[PDB]
Amino acid sequence: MSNSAIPLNVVAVQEPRLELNNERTWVVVKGGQQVTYYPFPSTSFSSNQFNFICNPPSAQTVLDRLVFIQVPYDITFTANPSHAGITENLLQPGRDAFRAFPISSITNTLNATINGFPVNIELAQIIHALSRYHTPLKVKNGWMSMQPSFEDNYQSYRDADGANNNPLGVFTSAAGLSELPRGSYTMNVVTNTTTTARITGVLYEQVFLPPFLWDGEQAGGLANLTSLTFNWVLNNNLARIWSHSDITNDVSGNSTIGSMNISFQQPSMYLGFVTPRLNIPIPPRITYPYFKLSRYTTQFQNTLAPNASSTFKSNVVQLDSIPRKLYLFVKQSDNVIYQNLNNQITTPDVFLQINNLNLTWNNQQGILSGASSQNLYDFSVQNGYNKTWSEFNGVTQQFNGVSGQPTKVIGLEGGIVCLELGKDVGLRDDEAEGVIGNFNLQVQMTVTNTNQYVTVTPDMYIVAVYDGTLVISNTSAMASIGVASKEEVLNARITHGVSYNELQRIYG
Amino acid sequence: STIGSMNISFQQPSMYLGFVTPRLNIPIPPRITYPYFKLSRYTTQFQNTLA
Numbered sequence: 001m002s003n004s005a006i007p008l009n010v011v012a013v014q015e016p017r018l019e020l021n022n023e024r025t026w027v028v029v030k031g032g033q034q035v036t037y038y039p040f041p042s043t044s045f046s047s048n049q050f051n052f053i054c055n056p057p058s059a060q061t062v063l064d065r066l067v068f069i070q071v072p073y074d075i076t077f078t079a080n081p082s083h084a085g086i087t088e089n090l091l092q093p094g095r096d097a098f099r100a101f102p103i104s105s106i107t108n109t110l111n112a113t114i115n116g117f118p119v120n121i122e123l124a125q126i127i128h129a130l131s132r133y134h135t136p137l138k139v140k141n142g143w144m145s146m147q148p149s150f151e152d153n154y155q156s157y158r159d160a161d162g163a164n165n166n167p168l169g170v171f172t173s174a175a176g177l178s179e180l181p182r183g184s185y186t187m188n189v190v191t192n193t194t195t196t197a198r199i200t201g202v203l204y205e206q207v208f209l210p211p212f213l214w215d216g217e218q219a220g221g222l223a224n225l226t227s228l229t230f231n232w233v234l235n236n237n238l239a240r241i242w243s244h245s246d247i248t249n250d251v252s253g254n255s256t257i258g259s260m261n262i263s264f265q266q267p268s269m270y271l272g273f274v275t276p277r278l279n280i281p282i283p284p285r286i287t288y289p290y291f292k293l294s295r296y297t298t299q300f301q302n303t304l305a306p307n308a309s310s311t312f313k314s315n316v317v318q319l320d321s322i323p324r325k326l327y328l329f330v331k332q333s334d335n336v337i338y339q340n341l342n343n344q345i346t347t348p349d350v351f352l353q354i355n356n357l358n359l360t361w362n363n364q365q366g367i368l369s370g371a372s373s374q375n376l377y378d379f380s381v382q383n384g385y386n387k388t389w390s391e392f393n394g395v396t397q398q399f400n401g402v403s404g405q406p407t408k409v410i411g412l413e414g415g416i417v418c419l420e421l422g423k424d425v426g427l428r429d430d431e432a433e434g435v436i437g438n439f440n441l442q443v444q445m446t447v448t449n450t451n452q453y454v455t456v457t458p459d460m461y462i463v464a465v466y467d468g469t470l471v472i473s474n475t476s477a478m479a480s481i482g483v484a485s486k487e488e489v490l491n492a493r494i495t496h497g498v499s500y501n502e503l504q505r506i507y508g
Numbered sequence: 509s510t511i512g513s514m515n516i517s518f519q520q521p522s523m524y525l526g527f528v529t530p531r532l533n534i535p536i537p538p539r540i541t542y543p544y545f546k547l548s549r550y551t552t553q554f555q556n557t558l559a
Contacts, residue, residue: 296554297554297556298555299555299556299557315554315555335557
């Protein structure tokens with residue numbers, strides 16, 4: 001051991017097949033008696049709102065963190081003339097589904113108030129890019145499975161047919177022990193003929209936003225609150241829930257569906273409340289981790305396609321405090337796909353392919369500026385990305401065997417960079433991962449539309465998550481942001497117990 | 509719209525002030541202090557639309 005250079009320290013370890021001794025301590029697991037579940041049916045449901053005001057039973061009972069709602073719903077489709085006709089059922093075996101996750105992207109915003117100081121998030125634009133980012137297969141087959149859950153991986157729906165991974169097919173045709181497509185999801189079909197379809201069922205969507213958690217891994221739920229209450233609002237259009245394929249819409253048209261309408265019934269939330277036992281007392285006041293994520297967004301006028309490139313920058317913003325990490329992507333814009341609804345039902349979620357990204361932290365200018373688009377995909381996947389290289393940088397050749405038909409190129413749906421803000425952006429001496437303040441940000445990024453048809457005006461999105469303390473003591477909910485002092489950040493002694501990998505484990 | 513487009517001129521604008529002079533008997537202090545408020549507007553425009 002003390003053979004080489006600077007000598008080391010010796011330790012020995014027993015192989016797994018044999019200890020055979022070590023100190024084996026019997027461990028009685030105990031948690032409070034009486035864990036019970038309630039179904040709080042929403043008071044004051046509407047067509048543009050849902051409001052669930054529910055009160056904790058005792059205020060001495062901890063409230064478990066996973067929460068979800070269920071909405072019974074009803075849609076009627078009908079055929080437009082022309083395109084007409086028309087001779088196939090208005091709903092098609094392989095060309096039709098819910099968008100994922102349905103009752104989510106449809107909702108404009110969600111805000112739950114605890115204790116009650118409100119913590120709210122933006123669910124329409126935030127989520128579709130938040131989904132890719134932290135889930136392993138283990139998770140996407142667990143909790144995440146209650147709502148349609150298969151993300152759009154073709155640049156255009158029309159192309160997909162008929163692949164083995166067409167994002168909206170029947171259950172049969174997803175290989176054993178894997179994530180099914182979104183035409184897997186169960187619901188009654190009361191009618192289905194040409195000129196008319198009409199469907200019914202019930203969809204379970206879990207709530208996102210902290211401190212309610214959509215990871216499987218759990219942590220001590222919020223006690224000792226005195227009243228909590230959720231509040232959705234859905235943006236007007238509501239044709240966004242459904243999905244479709246161009247492959248059937250063909251003509252000078254136009255298409256088969258336009259138009260159709262939805263209807264909800266009594267939704268209800270599902271809360272859960274353990275009780276701790278009279279032996280072990282939980283503290284009068286108690287502190288929780290708390291994250292806020294809020295998106296900043298430019299819109300441009302320039303129109304680029306069907307596969308031509310260009311460059312863009314986004315108006316400066318001044319963060320109050322360093323986000324713990326931020327995401328950046330260029331998605332196809334909102335101003336379109338909110339007109340003449342056929343567009344709403346037949347445009348996938350996917351983002352444009354990135355060529356390079358240079359950004360500026362406070363005053364720096366040109367950060368990362370010389371890192372290859374390949375070299376952007378290295379992190380994450382180190383912050384947990386989860387899509388093969390070919391998916392990022394989305395493009396894929398796939399050629400045809402005859403004389404003479406030119407090979408066909410498909411967009412494979414683009415990428416979204418996430419850069420953890422101290423992990424690989426670097427911060428001036430004596431500046432933590434979240435201290436006030438305040439530093440400009442500006443993202444200058446060149447992009448390319450890889451979707452074969454058609455042109456698209458884009459927008460840029462940048463979603464930054466901040467890390468604040470939140471102390472819920474009944475019945476106040478103070479929430480200090482930028483918790484560490486600038487003097488405390490120098491000479492805060494390092495530890496060798498905690499592993500950094502265990503901190504990136506706690507989402508987030 | 510019918511209206512487009514007009515042209516506006518001005519002439520010779522004049523201000524009016526009122527100057528009092530206090531009684532010779534009663535004296536005014538050589539150094540006075542008034543309250544003074546200062547207004548200043550900060551603006552951030554974001555370029556998104558909603559309708």
